Amino acid sequence: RLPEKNIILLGGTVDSQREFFEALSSNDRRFALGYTYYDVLDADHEDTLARISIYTLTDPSPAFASLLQPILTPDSIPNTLIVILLDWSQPWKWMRQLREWILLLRTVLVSLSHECKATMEEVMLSWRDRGRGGGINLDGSMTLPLGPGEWEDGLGLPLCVVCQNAEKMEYLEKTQGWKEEEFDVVLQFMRTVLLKHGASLIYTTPSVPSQLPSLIHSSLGIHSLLKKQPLKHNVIERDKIVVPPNWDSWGKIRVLREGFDVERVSNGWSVDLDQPYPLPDPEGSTVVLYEEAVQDPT
């Protein structure tokens, strides 16, 4: 009888998915995809607001991706969030991993019924203003034209990217010589491509409290009857990044550090996503730009 919400959880490992689940549901909780769920409590830890179902796909398999079809119906689509897990142990892999998941996901979404696609268009239209500072809160409850890059590439569903094990940033600083400005460049690259999908970005560390529950629950359209504090965005304190939807812009991305060609990187992401799924990297690719900038210690 509870409102039902879905998370489609992509990537990670067995342990990092479980860590995601704990981080997500710690405070405010009471041939197949992995499955679990939990009941979300309101901010006083009393009343139950929604039941969140999580469907998990660790690897970008086309076979198992097909299992998403039955989960995405006209009724479920407006209640669904895509979450991609990335790992701070291997940030050099991020842009390529992200491209693969998005191409995979697109393959599923174009295959849904006309009614599903009409519903996804409705969802995308309504997301334009959610949490944008005008009339509409991030959670979809009520209270200027779009900058460049913003929502140029709506997926049909909202996306949240969660970069796990951020304690490994300190590891890269001390054993691989990474400087503050290298973490910032990663951030500029991620913010730029994700902006095109209207997507959020958040870094987490196991056992370190974060805004992950508030971000995910608000993105799922779960409306607190007690709390009106909005999300707190951060792009400065490097291991606690929080970039909520409809907050970022090229203007903001460009000032983090100098020398970042935001438009080139945004156009390179068009090059990357205009490709069949599932050999060589196309001219202008942002995966290539990223992988030149963020090198693998091989």
Residue numbers in the entry: 44 to 73, 89 to 201, 211 to 345, 375 to 394
Article sentences:
The heavy chain ‘tail’ domain binds the associated subunits, which include the intermediate chain (IC), the light intermediate chain (LIC), and the light chains (LC): Tctex1, LC8, and LC7/roadblock. The LIC subunits, which are present in all cytoplasmic dyneins described thus far but absent from axonemal dyneins, are thought to play important roles in cargo transport. Interestingly, the C-terminal half of the protein is involved in binding Rab effectors, whereas the G domain is the docking site for the dynein heavy chain.
In this study, we report the crystal structure of the conserved N-terminal domain of the LIC from a thermophilic hyphal fungus, Chaetomium thermophilum, and show that it is composed of a canonical G protein fold. The LIC structure revealed a central β-sheet flanked by α-helices, which in comparison with other protein structures in the Protein Data Bank (PDB) using the Dali server, is most similar to the G domain of small GTP-binding proteins. Like Ras, the prototype of small G proteins, LIC has six β-strands in the core of the structure (five parallel and one anti-parallel) as well as five similarly placed α-helices. In addition to the five-α-helices found in Ras, the LIC G domain has two-α-helical insertions (α-helix 3a and 4a) that extend from the core of the structure. However, unlike most small GTP-binding proteins, the nucleotide pocket is empty, the P-loop exhibits a closed conformation and our biochemical experiments confirm that the fungal LIC G domain does not bind nucleotide. Unusual for G proteins, the ‘P-loop’ and ‘switch 2’ of the C. thermophilum LIC G domain interact with one another; the side chain of Q60 in the P-loop hydrogen bonds with the main chain carbonyl of G54 and the side chain of T116 in switch 2. Relatively few universally conserved residues are on the surface of the LIC G domain, with the exception of a hydrophobic groove of universally conserved residues composed of three aromatic residues (Y93, Y95 [β2], and Y113 [β3]) and Leu125 (α2) (residue numbers refer to the position in C. thermophilum LIC). In contrast, the other five double or triple mutations tested bound normally to the dynein heavy chain. These results indicate that the universally conserved hydrophobic groove on the LIC is involved in binding to the dynein heavy chain.
